[PDB]
User: Which sequence fits this backbone?
């Protein structure tokens, strides 16, 4: 059934699983028309499909052309997401296909279950975890490949860079969600923390800066502070 | 007019015959039911006074044989049986009628309720849902599970309703996942109607039989089947006009007949609110929507 704090460690066992987050699939800017009505303009989106054990991110870029001439786009977006995840599973060798897919929003359950009827042995699960994957588009290199795309495209990343050489997947997911939660709560502050020091750079083949172990402890402390701060500015505490 | 005699009534029991019912005391001089209308299926059903658990009964059609009821003290129930000796049977019925030991099927002449509840129900189709080919009548009780329930345990004693499952490969064409899940017309019209049921009459007959088993025996899987067959129609954007009009009449009479006090266990709130207020057919069931809103506004 549902994934929560009681069965956390299940994410870092040796049963292949993927998180699917659809919160950046259908993205729009809202604007006024010349007549003073309101209209939307779609912008490129992405499906966020992540193996939390290995860090492998299957970023499926959703080009605005997929919405042309379609109605009820917020509903279509869930089914398009399910279509693309199903296509991804079918493209993988049998021994790489996931045993479970965990959707971050319950409205993905039926779309994905229907698209995966051919895979009765793959469990489709919700989660009670408050995951901040919507902030993926605050990672500059992910945002850049999404916005530059002129056609549908899948791009593969490791969202943990080389962290697993030094830390466990549990710790790496701990760090990833702390970074993303900060970027979601105060993007400007979080990005200043990550980059305020020009001597620490992001390698061409990485997403995040090349912090030493000691520097990651400082960074992680600053991100907690930020999350606590904003929580204070928010509720006045 | 046909007759179902009883050998005797050795245990106190409430007896149902279609939508009617009456109490018989232990060893009361009761010898059956006369004046049963020819042309319809019928159900004769039982609830023992000392164990209201297990309602049970028999679907039959008097045109198919001479049937009687006899209590079995070993199996502890009233059993339907067929008498092949037509002269024996006629002699027995005549004696019991002359001694006025039978209740009369109490049909009001204005009253089309039973016809309206069984319009599409055929004995031949009942016998395919309830498999026991050596008898011309069919036993049903409160506890019998459906073939679908058994997939989610004795197969000889199951209700073989047509399996309807909205998240199944049968219901969903590859490449039309969203379309077929949000508009079930393909599943209704091509898979179920053209493919399995052959026509809407057989579909309605199974629907009507499922409701009646839900109502008379509190059979849970029958209630699930009734609602699934309603929902499949209401969730289809393309339904023949004559089927919608007939469905509205079918449902109206089912809702009209349902005991007011059982509405809480026989009506699925989700299905009915979806069907009447959100579905493609939300404006097509005028009679049913009116009786539901005036009789069970709580549920909605
Ligand atoms: C390894 O798990 C954690 O460090 C805590 C999870 C709870 C929700 S989260 O997104 O913060 C991730």
Assistant:
């Amino acid at each position: 059934g549902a994934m929560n704090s009681s069965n956390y460690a299940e994410l870092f066992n040796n049963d292949i699983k993927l998180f699917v987050d659809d919160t950046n699939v259908y993205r729009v800017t809202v604007h006024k028309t010349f007549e003073g009505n309101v209209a939307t303009k779609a912008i490129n989106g992405c499906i966020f499909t992540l193996n939390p054990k290995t860090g492998h991110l299957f970023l499926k870029i959703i080009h605005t052309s997929v919405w042309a001439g379609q109605k009820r786009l917020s509903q279509l977006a869930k089914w398009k997401t399910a279509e693309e995840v199903s296509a991804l599973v079918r493209s993988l060798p049998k021994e790489e296909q996931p045993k479970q897919i965990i959707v971050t929003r319950k409205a993905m359950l039926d779309p994905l279950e229907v698209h995966m009827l051919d895979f009765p042995n793959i469990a489709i699960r919700p989660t009670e975890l408050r995951l901040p994957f919507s902030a993926a588009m605050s990672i500059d290199k992910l945002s850049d490949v999404v916005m530059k795309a002129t056609e549908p495209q899948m791009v593969l990343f490791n969202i943990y860079d080389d962290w697993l050489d030094r830390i466990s997947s549990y710790t790496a997911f701990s760090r990833l969600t702390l970074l993303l939660r900060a970027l979601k709560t105060n993007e400007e502050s979080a990005k200043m923390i990550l980059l305020s020091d020009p001597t620490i750079t992001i390698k061409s083949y990485h997403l995040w800066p090349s912090f030493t172990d000691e520097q990651w402890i400082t960074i992680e402390s600053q991100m907690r502070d930020l999350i606590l701060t904003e929580y204070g500015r928010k509720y006045n505490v | 007019m046909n007759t179902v005699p009883f050998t005797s009534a050795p245990i106190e029991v409430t007896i149902g015959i279609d939508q009617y019912s009456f109490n018989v005391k232990e060893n009361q001089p009761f010898h059956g039911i006369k004046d049963i209308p020819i042309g319809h299926v019928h159900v004769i059903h039982f609830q023992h006074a000392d164990n209201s658990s297990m309602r049970y009964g028999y679907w039959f059609d008097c045109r198919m044989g001479n049937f009687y009821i006899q209590y079995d003290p070993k199996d502890g129930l009233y059993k339907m049986m067929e008498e092949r000796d037509g002269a024996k049977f006629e002699n027995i019925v005549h004696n019991f009628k002359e001694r006025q030991m039978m209740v009369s099927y109490p049909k009001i002449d204005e009253d089309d309720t039973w016809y309206n509840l069984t319009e599409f129900v055929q004995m031949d189709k009942i016998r395919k849902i309830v498999r026991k080919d050596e008898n011309q009548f069919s036993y049903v009780d409160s506890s019998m599970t459906t073939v679908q329930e058994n997939e989610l345990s004795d197969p000889a004693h199951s209700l073989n309703y047509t399996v309807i499952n909205f998240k199944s490969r049968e219901a969903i064409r590859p490449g039309h996942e969203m379309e077929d899940f949000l508009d079930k017309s393909y599943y209704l019209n091509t898979v179920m109607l053209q493919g399995i049921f052959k026509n809407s009459s057989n579909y309605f007959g199974e629907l009507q039989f499922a409701f009646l088993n839900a109502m008379f025996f509190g059979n849970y899987g029958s209630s699930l089947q009734w609602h699934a067959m309603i929902e499949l129609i209401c969730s289809s954007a393309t339904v023949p006009k004559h089927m919608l009009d007939k469905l509205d009449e079918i449902l109206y009479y089912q809702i009209k007949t349902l005991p007011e006090q059982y509405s809480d266990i026989l009506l699925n709130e989700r299905v009915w609110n979806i069907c009447l207020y959100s579905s493609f057919q939300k404006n097509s069931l005028h009679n049913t929507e009116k009786i539901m809103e005036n009789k069970y506004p709580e549920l909605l």
